[PDB]
């Protein structure tokens, strides 16, 4: 006999399992099972599907393997099947995230500016955030080599359970990164995995319970804290407020001193209110008068934009951003 | 009890009491009880019952306790744990014996998942 032959046949078996993701093997994988139990995924979502979601596309081994001298070696993963990876799933998951999150944000804040809305959406479902979520869930990367695994003589089940992409061995050894594309990044792979899981959930539940996916998203993605007030940065807000007042049936906004203390000091306090008629729109405190005025305008704009109506109200469609 | 303004308001706080210890909370807030919970395991949900005050920005319902029907307030038990281990030394002023008073009290991290006017 020969040990090379033994290793080779093991590798071939592993490749075959990757191509298939046979259901029994996937079921045997403890990590997959624990992930399934943790997230409370549907029973219709098979363990093979879950394994596939963790399998990123990796058809051909790249040219950068040829030289570890240039700071890269791809020796962990094994080539995947063209029609059994997380790629199609991932896209679907991304689409779902882009739809649902955005919709939820619009429901919450129907006048939110376009740029601000986009930023909020990004915050909810940015690649980094998605990767973090995946890590939290316990989607671990297949860092160990194939040869090493063979030597240890571990089953293929464990491999199936881990996340599988062209992860560069010696990525940041001796403090040297190679700056490769998105197809070799860990964060991206983790993002894909979390999107792929969502897509798989959708696939299994859509006919029985159409909104199951969206409630899962709400539970995991939309449950996260984001203060929308911290997102804004105005420029000349008084002018913008005046424009808004003009657009609506409101009197011209003027700022007026409500209260004042410590004028002729290092740190005064000036309270000014931007009135439109007798109604106050924005209240603004400040060290200077100018500052206070600015703050009142910004407050007014916040109140305009971040207005969140009740669920009992009929839908509020805003009349666009205030084009100054 | 006309509880309409509270119901309307987007922001809302509660001052529920566990063993007469008040904890002022909103939804998402992460309460740290200074004892080991025996009844609930980790993952279990706690329906708060002795809710003293339920407040908006300008209004507040108050009871001793408030009617359970009027509100919901679900905490989740998100980890039993402990405080950091400390060893203060106890000794008298011309005495070489120095008794070490070791201490490492228990904690229970709750998370206020739901808080709303029913």
């Amino acid at each position: 006999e020969s040990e090379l032959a033994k290793y080779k046949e093991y590798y071939q078996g592993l490749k075959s399992t990757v191509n298939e993701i046979p259901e029994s093997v996937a079921s045997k994988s403890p990590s997959l099972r624990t992930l399934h139990k943790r997230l409370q995924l549907p029973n219709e979502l098979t363990y093979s599907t879950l394994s596939r979601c963790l399998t990123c596309p990796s058809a051909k081994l790249p040219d950068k393997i040829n030289n570890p001298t240039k700071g890269a070696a791809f020796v962990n993963t094994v080539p995947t099947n063209k029609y059994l990876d997380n790629h199609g799933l991932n896209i679907m998951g991304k689409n779902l995230l882009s739809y649902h999150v955005t919709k939820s944000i619009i429901q919450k804040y129907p006048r939110l500016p376009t740029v601000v809305l986009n930023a909020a959406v990004n915050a909810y479902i940015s690649e980094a955030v998605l990767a973090h979520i995946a890590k939290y869930w316990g989607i671990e990367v297949e860092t160990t080599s194939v040869l090493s695994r063979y030597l240890k003589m571990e089953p293929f089940e464990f491999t199936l359970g881990r996340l599988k992409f062209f992860n560069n061995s010696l990525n940041s050894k001796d403090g040297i990164e190679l700056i490769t594309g998105k197809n070799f990044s860990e964060t991206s792979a983790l993002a894909m995995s979390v999107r792929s899981i969502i897509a798989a959930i959708w696939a299994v539940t859509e006919q029985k319970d159409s909104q199951a996916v969206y409630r899962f998203i709400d539970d995991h993605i939309m449950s996260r804290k984001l203060d929308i007030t911290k997102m804004f940065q105005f420029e000349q807000p008084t002018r913008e407020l005046a424009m808004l007042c003009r657009r609506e049936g409101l009197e011209k906004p003027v700022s007026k001193l409500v209260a004042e203390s410590g004028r002729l000091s290092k740190s005064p306090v000036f309270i000014v209110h931007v009135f439109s008629g007798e109604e106050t729109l924005g209240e603004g405190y400040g060290s200077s008068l100018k500052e206070a005025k600015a703050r009142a305008a910004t407050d007014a704009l916040m109140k305009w934009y971040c207005y969140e109506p009740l669920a009992q109200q009929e839908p509020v469609i805003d009349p666009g951003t205030v084009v100054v | 009890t006309d509880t309409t303004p509270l119901k309307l308001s987007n922001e809302l706080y509660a001052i529920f009491k566990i063993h007469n210890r008040p904890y002022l909370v909103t939804e998402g807030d992460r309460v740290i009880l200074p004892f080991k919970l025996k009844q609930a395991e980790v993952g279990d949900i706690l329906n708060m019952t002795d809710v003293t005050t339920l407040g908006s920005r300008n209004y507040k319902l108050v009871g001793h306790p408030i009617n359970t029907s009027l509100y919901t307030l679900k905490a989740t038990v998100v980890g039993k744990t402990k405080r950091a281990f400390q060893t203060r030394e106890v000794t008298k002023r011309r005495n070489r014996r120095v008794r070490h008073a070791k201490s490492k009290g228990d904690l229970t991290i709750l998370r206020i998942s739901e808080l709303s006017m029913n």
Binding site: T34, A119, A128, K225, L226, D227 | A84, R111, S113
Partner: protein, 138 residues
């Protein structure tokens, strides 16, 4: 004119879907080594199976090493508790395992008096202001 500030969301584990903090536990023992007796007994005696049945979201690795017997947990936040269970009986080991599973992974920390609630949320009522107080000072 209005511009966004790039900002990211904060995950509150409990509020939507509770992800269980403990993700993996490794039982480590030695075949030699008299300190690993209680661990060995625990591994043998149907308790581990029951445990796994109870908690199917935790994976239970069982390893053999030359040193003292070890219980290393692994949590969602990425931290790792490792308890050496040298010379402990079966029941003590089980208690230790229970303690580990109970833990949210976070580091141990001194709390001051009444440092109870930890909010991301802005106050429902505002922050106090002397100009806006009900009773004016003198």
């Amino acid at each position: 004119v209005v511009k966004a500030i790039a900002r990211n969301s904060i995950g509150r584990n409990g509020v939507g879907a509770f992800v269980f903090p403990c993700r993996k536990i490794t039982l480590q023992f030695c075949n030699w080594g008299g300190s690993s007796e209680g661990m060995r007994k625990f591994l043998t005696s149907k308790r581990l199976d029951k445990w796994g049945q109870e908690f199917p979201w935790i994976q239970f690795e069982v390893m053999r090493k030359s040193g003292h017997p070890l219980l290393r947990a692994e949590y969602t936040n990425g931290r790792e508790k490792v308890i050496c269970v040298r010379n402990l009986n079966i029941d003590n080991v089980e208690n230790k395992l229970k303690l580990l599973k109970d833990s949210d992974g976070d580091i141990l920390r001194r709390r001051t008096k009444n440092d109870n609630v930890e909010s991301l949320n802005s106050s429902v009522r505002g922050i106090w202001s002397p100009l806006h107080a009900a009773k004016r000072h003198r």
